[PDB]
Amino acid sequence: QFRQALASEHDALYNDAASPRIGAKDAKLVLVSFTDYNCPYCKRFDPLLEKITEQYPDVAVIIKPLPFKGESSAKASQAVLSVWKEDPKAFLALHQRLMQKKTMLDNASIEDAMKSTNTSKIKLTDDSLKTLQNNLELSRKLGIQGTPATVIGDTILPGAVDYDQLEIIVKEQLAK
């Protein structure tokens, strides 16, 4: 009930237009990053996921924000998803800024991040919460109970690893 769930959730994982993507549209390997903007391990792990896409252009990353850590997690998710829907090219800078914030986010922090990334004119939509609902449903089906969690091929990486190990994992999934 795993490679079965992974197969059953293929479209939700890889083919949701409302889910932000980092890296090439023609990638041979797409990582799916279930992440939380208030999770300290996500803050550690995210820049490694991004580095992968910059170092290895055959790898892309899909971002699935989850709101597990706190209420502002849901609000931050709402912000980046709204930005992706309206201006996909503006998403990355906001995503990075929210991820590197040392403090637990709140509405002020999130509004400030959007101001300094030139995304503050983009309105937080109700429709983007439906994407957040989809991410939550998806997390349940796959048995994801914590962040970060990364789908890489036919396996799920349920925590954070260092870059050397991520390279290793990513390289053999490419070897198939």
Numbering used by the authors: 46 to 221
Quoted from the paper:
Like DsbC, PmScsC is a protein disulfide isomerase with a thioredoxin-fold catalytic domain, redox-active cysteines and a redox-partner membrane protein (PmScsB) that reduces the active-site cysteines. The native PmScsC protomer consists of an N-terminal trimerization stem with an 11-amino-acid flexible linker connected to a C-terminal thioredoxin-fold catalytic domain harbouring a CXXC active site.
Crystals of the PmScsCΔN mutant diffracted to a resolution of 2.15 Å at the Australian Synchrotron. The X-ray crystal structure of PmScsCΔN agrees with previous MALS data showing that this variant is monomeric. The crystal structure is also consistent with solution SAXS data and the low-resolution model obtained from SAXS analysis. Although the PmScsCΔN crystal structure is very similar to the structures of the catalytic domains in each of the three crystal structures of native PmScsC, unlike the native enzyme it lacks disulfide isomerase (disulfide-shuffling) activity and instead has dithiol oxidase (disulfide-forming) activity. In the crystal packing, PmScsCΔN makes contact with six symmetry-related molecules, but none involve packing against the catalytic motif or the positively charged surface patch that surrounds it.
